[PDB]
């Protein structure tokens, strides 16, 4: 899976261990081995949410399977919890787009997963 | 909705009030309340369009509904208009990707919109 | 088409002409004229792949058609090859998301391709 967070919080406010924490927590949540999980955090962004620029985050989670109505509701709680505690972002200022991808449309290691 | 603009134009050329202009204009265009609109502007990017590094922009608008043939033409006119007027980017050097998302695939505040 | 590469490799490690090579090679691979290829390279990112912060990349290729099983394998070989040779990123630390988009959902020049 691939998890991306874009945020206006400054780089200094993103803990050094945040990417590893996200990796491990997403591995548990998706049931995928952590070696497969990629994480990308983009701080210092020029953003607004609801016309205001208090801390906020725009995220996406991409996976081959393990995406669906109930699962996504559960991922939102996991990810809002982490963003709230580690980045101090209110959960009502977080959007997460979920993508359930076909293996044929995910490239890796000179090929695709298909 | 969520609107993202990636451009090679320098930060200094992004007018103050641009995020608010995008928020309000998108509210009127989509008919969605401004409190749900998220906007993200990323200047100073390393990009090319047609091989040329003259000003360009790569955008994306994500929405639950309010996306379609007719609506997208209207959004493109509005958004290229703003990028031309405010950022001095030629409309033929702008791409906008439109995403009509299922409510179940959009996380917000510890749940999804489904 | 639109190709985006996000990487933790430093900017100084992206060779001069990389955006031109991507434009040219993607035009050849997709069969699309190079005038309509947009490329976006984002170095110096805060990223992890499998919990390691060694060089990695997360990419996407969006196209109206020219996306499918066999084609995507070919694009992945091409693109992972370039990331390995030019940016020194191991192919097993690259993900590429492929998106086959409807013309009605791609804005350009004040309109859409629909
Ligand atoms: C199950 C595995 O061995 C590898 C994973 O399936 C890769 C994966 N789920 C994956 C990686 C990047 C993506 O962007 C994505 F949508 C899915
Ligand atoms: C008025 C509402 O019910 C909330 C909005 O409809 C949410 C929305 N359309 C929305 C927000 C962020 C997204 O990334 C997205 F794809 C859709
Ligand atoms: C006449 C053409 O060949 C136009 C191209 O098909 C544009 C194209 N495939 C394209 C451009 C930007 C995009 O973001 C995208 F998803 C697709
Ligand atoms: Cl720390
Ligand atoms: Cl589910
Ligand atoms: Cl897919
Ligand atoms: Cl969706
Ligand atoms: Cl194919
Ligand atoms: Cl589409």
Numbering used by the authors:
A (entry chain A), B (entry chain C), C (entry chain B): 1 to 114
What's the paper's own text on this?
MIF is a pleiotropic cytokine broadly studied in sepsis and many infectious and auto-immune diseases. Recently, a causative role in cancer progression has been attributed to MIF, as it has been reported to inactivate p53 (29), enhance angiogenesis, promote metastasis and impair both innate and adaptive immune responses. ISO-1, the ‘gold standard’ inhibitor of MIF, was designed to selectively ligate the tautomerase catalytic site of MIF which is known to neutralize its pro-inflammatory activity. We have identified ISO-66, a novel analog of ISO-1, as a potent inhibitor of MIF tautomerase activity.
